[model samples]
Target: VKVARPCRKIEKWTYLELKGSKANEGVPQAMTAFAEFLNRTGIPINPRFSPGMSMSVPGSEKEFFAKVKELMSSHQFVVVLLPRKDVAIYNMVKRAADITFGVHTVCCVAEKFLSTKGQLGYFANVGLKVNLKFGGTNHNIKTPIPLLAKGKTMVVGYDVTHPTNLAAGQSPASAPSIVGLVSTIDQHLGQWPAMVWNNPHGQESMTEQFTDKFKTRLELWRSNPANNRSLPENILIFRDGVSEGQFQMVIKDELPLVRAACKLVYPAGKLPRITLIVSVHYTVLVDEIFRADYGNKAADTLEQLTHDMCYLCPPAYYADLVCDRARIHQKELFDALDENDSVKTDDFARWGNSGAVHPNLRNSMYYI
Candidate 1:
């Protein structure tokens, strides 16, 4: 139990490994290390579940389906190591085998495992994703636990991933868009159930279907006994992958549908207060430290919502100079809104909520 509450445990978890290419070297050992990290963090899976490695990757759609079925018959999950060049295989496996066969598969690029060997904290993030997929909770914050204080608040995160490039001779009319929606299942905002939908070629927006799926999530949330058989009083939505210029379009096309979902659950006036925070397509920096030489103290006021790591002069104090120089090249962008103050104030306040949060999540970069 954590924080005087009983945390759910994953009593048994079985996993297997599949490679998408022969170039995926050291994948067997990498999978073993990943499972070791999971168990070290208390996920409770024995090493016996590692059924070695498959001899070859499935070459076709039929072979993929058959292999998935065979694995599902014994293993509860599969870890697919995708080669760098065969990234499309990841999409096919997710869209075809995972969605249809009802099997849990975690696909990761083979290179990440090799690179992140000693970075155990990063593995914690992987473990968190794994737990979410299996209907389990990983970790919960102790302080500022307002997410569980009041009536259950269902926090929803929505995003759409567009393909960066198409295959040879593949037209935009045949490419698909992937929509991902994740909603909170527990009061701690830790357990989230995810649903993914694919839009056919030439189809861009999922405004209508998004509304329907959201309503389904609300119904499922209310169906839980821990929620006291009642609907949530708050519905918070964080929409990603939208640009500042498209704000008006989102408000026009998606906002009403969200309202309709609430009205579908309750009569007029009894609908919950919906707070929608939209993050643009780019990364938004929330918090940064300024030393006495770098800033004026009175200019900033925000509470810390989270922490960040700086691989610079202090933490990795004696690290190679070239490494620190390369790492510091990355900068955090707080570009949630554009450069116009008038538009920012007007557009943000229209939703009847301010974007300020604990210093940790300034500019609404909580997830970044």
Candidate 2:
């Protein structure tokens, strides 16, 4: 896992404090804390100070862009510390930095940077982003032996972050949900490069570009020489934010998309065994007495000792228990299940396993 560290490091960087007249007041003190933090992480950043240019004034967008362009010609990177409330300026600076200079820019919020107590954690997160942007690796984690024992494995994680409803008296344009897909690039499964897309249709439950983005990651994985193979033999997907009601939709819609992607990547190559795990916000409690043989004290110890203990029962019993419990309460935690709730229990049985000492108690039931 510790073979090589990421090579990207900031050689010569420039700092711009956009506080205008207030720039000179606390710039040195904040910079000292930031620099010391980066040193421990091995980024080796010694930012050259630039106090002449200021972004505090209005109608200076062009001037600010020009100054950034000029300064970027000599420096490898630029760091800006600006007021946290100026969202417009921050976005404008980022867009200009990406388009005009064609170089990376790291922004540190003035409030966070000036906070002496929060400097360590704030700068640590900033340092990680900067290092990764410049093609540097931060840490390495050892993969499980069983996972590595296979020929090759690629881990994929997918999720969507949706925007909250608009506030009263604040009518901004409708915001699109952001879908993020990340995959492990190397054999270590430590370095995960991510891709994001905007879902304009407000589809928070699914990503529109799931297959296309995943194919690109697969292409890169196959192209890497370190892998020494054309494709991975095993694929493990960890999906996020899905609900129990969407289990059927995942099996019907998303599962096929993944299969089609695999076929597109390699028509002749043998498809890897896919193990998809969905992370949801649901819990199931046991009602039956399958473990009654253990008595009260032993059952209590088992329940407290290990968290993986499952209660086995038929799917009908689960649905009945769920519905009966819902009728007894009227709160956020006791929402009534739809008539089709039993279908979820039935579907869960297909993907679940049994862990019981007796053969009769091996039937599938809900587990944590």
Candidate 3:
């Protein structure tokens, strides 16, 4: 049993509780008096979160994420875990779900929706092209690091050119793209070996010329006189503008030709390594494929969807493109479409995300 406290009855004195007022003082006198009392106290006042507690109270991981997003609205400072890639586990899980649900939809969303805003930074501008060819001296290139090989890795980069002005009621049409493929004896990680400029000066034929370029690069990479070792794999092929539909073409049609080419280059029956990396930059077909434009599902695998929504949506670009006053000096999810370079920009600015690079691989330029 608990006992209640007794109520105290005090005698009221109806007297003047007035005090001398200070000149030029503003506000209710009671509040002012409280301020005075605080000033008189010798203890210092500090505004900060208690140690071991997050600044904001969160009911769930999702709620914590939402708060982080709110804080990143100003782009003044971003809390992240990696140098370029930033994302939360929850976000990744969400993306993977999208992919698992609809791979084609996710692909369409990424290929079409992303790159529209032109805010993807270095990754967009880099124009990394995958060169697939069969023949002579072959080079090997691997990710996270490119091992030194006798024959140098061929560099190839290409971009689809689009008209600055739309014709009639149509949107801007793709222009004649330039495809460049080159083999350099010296290995430089910063630059590429081949370059394909869609339009050099707006005076080239606009044609889908991958097959031709593929054959060209294959002969070029294999024809290197400096190659002494037998080829290990077929020619490496990195393709841009690839979609699920294109995936079939790559694994079937393009791959067979490449394998045959490898046979021509290395008579010892050693096949060249063929790598297929899709750029998936701005392509018109993206819209038709993604978002169920043609009665397809929207998401496929969570991992693929994660890459699509955050990287491909082109949110930052569209926002800034339409409303210039809409400031995005905030997190990536808030202003990702407005960033200068998707690759170089902090992931926090591009996706409101963060992840950690293992301590062992912080500064190693194995695949630079």
Candidate 4:
């Protein structure tokens, strides 16, 4: 369908616009232009909402987080104006909103959000994000895609990333591997809320909880508004970061858990038809399938072939991005230290919350 739009509308919402003293980043301009931003974005819905709670003071990471809680005291969403650049501040705000307290914040650098014309363009962009996170539908596609139809199929993605400690290296035994799980929440496949977990590395082990993870993804599928609250009859699993040596091993271990997850989701004890596609990008150990006319095909030829052939699956691409986002969250996990120049004891607690996002965003595309 070339023409598709969302039936969903945001009925009620409010946002806090916070600005650092020097960095208003055009907070005043942003606040004043809120109405203009809404109109400029061209979103389908003219939603009814509150729009005050704009703060004018700059604060340290701790100060900003505390004040956020006070307002959030979703308590709905926030638009933060930074005076300058600080990944620490951005990470801290992200940590507080997503994992710890469960809110939503959009951070913008002052350089971009300054002046009238600039504010219009920038807010139009991030505002789409806001509308997306706040229960508004993004879009729908009607064009026919092979292997995909209007309904009955759920496209899913799975991946895991091992992140090194920020300040130092931890033993492999203690390092955490963040796992991302995602599935199509709509028939058109426009929306996919993500799930992430902090699983410790174990000799390529990602089992047991995989069942629970699949279960939650199934639940997400059912809860999707576009699905009309139904379970998909077919499951398409897109896998990344697995090698041929470990492919069969993964199936032997995780396949049963998937059926088990299906058992938990449905009363029939029957499972949906499952299709798995693994990304064997860097490991084509043998060329028996696609033979070359002469000297084993040039490397660049093979590379181009690989690129063209493997660019088909978006589930894997999304899963990869989701992994990177979770990786960002966990990087700050151990960056904090004690006054005595030692790692803080609470770092463990922080690490625990690192991979989890707020429930508000669990069903939304918050990972982006």
Candidate 5:
């Protein structure tokens, strides 16, 4: 929903802003205008924001995770300015967390850098090189915090990175990647529940990997007899990086694997809720500079579709389907690398302009 008038006093609100020297994409200007609009509307800018840590600067993953942990645990309002290209590192962080026995880093990333607009006191945005990573709830969700906290949440996330190279005699195939995510529900309303990671070439293979690892880990975490006596009431599964080609495989083959894994791992406990969702985009436009599609509308639509699919199922049994599409074609596709490279050729330009949709269209158009 569009805020016709800026809010002066928001009791419980979050402002996720991404800014910094490396964020040379006019973020500050947009933010400044927003601030002015807020001021004019008599909305006092409640400067209780936060920042995400930058991954652009060279650093170790462990150190970065430490910093993120601190921010998520403590700060509310923050800002993180970063070079856009390095945002993919955080994507890796979310992916790694999904695979292991850890919580998702949806709320913080503040150990890396400072912001140019230090005074806004704004909430931080995860500096995703790809705009797709930047997201949040547009509306408020008011739900009671379970007294027993038996509700389990599954945080499912997926990634799709196109290949820089093409399929050839000895060359590597397209760089299409996908990941699956599942997490026990957290009490907090706005935290990631699960995550999945996928690299191009073998999305199906990745699903198998996720299923195997997830079942093993789920068993260990649930029956840590040393931990809790009563197991979680509901278990939700989220899938990321599933494609149209592999959608059925995920719904039919993979989820059963998850159930089996749970049974073998936690035999005595009640089966938690389960759901499967495939995040697919119907349209995608890559930037000329290889800038991540953080603001890409198509990507965002696909991402939302993922969540909707999972939302349909109850905390028991399972849901059969959730399908979304991602659009993945554009003019500046290949030119991001070699600026001087021209499409001009005796017949090269004509071939690209006239060819029907085929595998060749992807490369001949711009891909080198």
Candidate 6:
């Protein structure tokens, strides 16, 4: 993830290493490789990652809550040595670091961080997340992105998620569906911030509030001075989770509102070119086509593009991931039931209506 992106050095750090037991010695050589990796990535550290900072957490969760606050005042970020993995310990570490204190954290596991081999690949993967938390872009695709190859273009991806019931009170259609919109902010094709709406019970199409949602993204792109304080020259959308039968519904109901949003947000003649691809495995049409428009040059460019991006709809996948995590944090669905096994209106509403990332980390790549 560091091909072009640079990372910042952290100040006032320590190795608050957590271990299951002291008898469990990890390859200390792993620490050397990580420090070296951090140096190459530009996040240089001090001699602070020493034995003095290593500690044990016999009672995992409590130990984290107990120790993190002490370091919060002194450390800008913690490169904690998790001698092992325990969801409880990791969750507590995040709750304290990312949530409560909002300090950046890198929880290196003994297996990966302490491994002799896999050093380069490990640094590539783990370092990206840590670097993003410290506010930097990840390395992105070098190839041209077909329609999105040239100019300042913002890619927007949308999807709808349905509810699942362990104890049936309401059918999937009777419950709210989460509508998610993820759009590129830095144009690196990596820094996508997500926005989600809990649609009224059972609604699948993101068409209703599409205008406002798109406008928010347009403004986000515009607000970034790096984008030259102007709207993108092009907007390409990937609409996912729609059934084959709902093809016309997307064209008839969703397309105009998106265009309508542009008309309202951008001033005249800045009428940006737009393309919405609705995939069965996929579908494409430059409905609002213009001249010499490699619209046909697409087959050469597109099939190639599809072959490249065919294995992934990253935006849609992330939108789904964001929703799943959003739902995890919401934690109200299971509680949204009454004694009669009927869905409680108020309880259900709380789960469906959710919100943002920690302000300090907003728009950063912390989601990974």
Quantify all predictions' global Cα lDDT against the true fold.
Answer: 0.49, 0.51, 0.28, 0.60, 0.35, 0.63
For 1-368, candidate 6 gives per-residue lDDT tens digits of 23356556665555566765544455455555666676676655543454325567756545566666777546766677676777657755665665556666777786666666876888767666766556555554567564555538787777766554435455544555667678887555546777766655544435567788888899989998677787888776778878876667677767788888999998887778887777436677454432235656655665565454433277667766666655544434543432344555455555555333455655655555
User: How many clashing residue pairs appear in each of the predictions shown?
Assistant: 7, 1, 58, 2, 50, 1
Model 3, position 111, has a per-residue lDDT of 23
Ranked by lDDT, top first: 6, 4, 2, 1, 5, 3
Residue pairs clashing in model 6 are 279-282
- C-alpha lDDT of candidate 5 relative to the true structure: 0.35
Residue pairs that clash (backbone atoms under 3 angstroms), model 2: 6-137
Model 1, runs deviating above 4 Å: 1-37, 50-53, 81-86, 95-97, 108-125, 145-148, 160-179, 198-210, 281-368
Q: List where candidate 6 sits over 4 angstroms from the true fold.
A: 12-18, 21-33, 43-76, 80-100, 140-149, 164-174, 200-210, 248-257, 285-292, 306-312, 334-345, 348-355
lDDT of 5 at 350: 35
Stretches > 4 Å off in candidate 4: 1-26, 39-60, 164-176, 201-205, 223-229, 266-270, 280-314, 336-350
Best by lDDT: 6
Query: Mind giving the per-residue lDDT tens digits that candidate 2 earns over 1-368?
Result: 11125435566666666764445456666776666667677766664344324456357667777756677555666678776657557655654554345456677777777877867888888876665555555654333334443438776666554332444553322333344555655565434555444443343223455667678878878877878756877665655656777666566767677777888886565776675656442222221221333355644433331221111111222223322221221111112123322223222222111111112111111110
Candidate 3 lDDT score relative to the true structure: 0.28
Measured against the true structure, the TM-scores of the candidates, in listed sequence, are: 0.59, 0.58, 0.27, 0.72, 0.37, 0.76
Model 1 residue pairs with clashes: 285-333, 302-359, 303-358, 303-359, 303-360, 304-360, 305-360
> lDDT by residue for model 3 over 1-368, one digit each (tens)?
10011111111101011112222122123222322232223111111111111232244555544544433322211112111122433233222221111110001111211232442332211111000110111222332212223333433333232212334453222322222232222232222233232331222222233445455555544444544442333232334544557566445544455446455556564444444444565322222122422133433321243243232122222222212111111223333434542222233322212222112222111011
The TM-score measured for candidate 2 stands at 0.58
**Candidate number of the best TM-score:** 6
Candidate 4 on 80-154: residue-level lDDT in tens?
Answer: 655568676677667777766776667777656666656666766776666656545455433333334447778
- Residue 221 local lDDT, model 4: 81
Judged by whole-model lDDT over C-alpha atoms, candidate 6 comes out at: 0.63
Q: Comparing candidate 1 with candidate 3, which one achieves the higher lDDT?
A: 1
Q: Write the per-residue lDDT of candidate 1 for residues 1-368, one digit (tens) a residue.
A: 11222223533334444544445555556666777777776665455553644545666766776766666544556666555546446555553333345445566665675575554665667665565555454555454323334645666666655432455676653344445565665465544555545443423336546668778888878887778777887665656767786566557766677778888887668887665656542222211222221245312211121111110011111112212211121111112212321122233222112211222111111121
Model 2: how far residue 2 lies from native, Å: 12
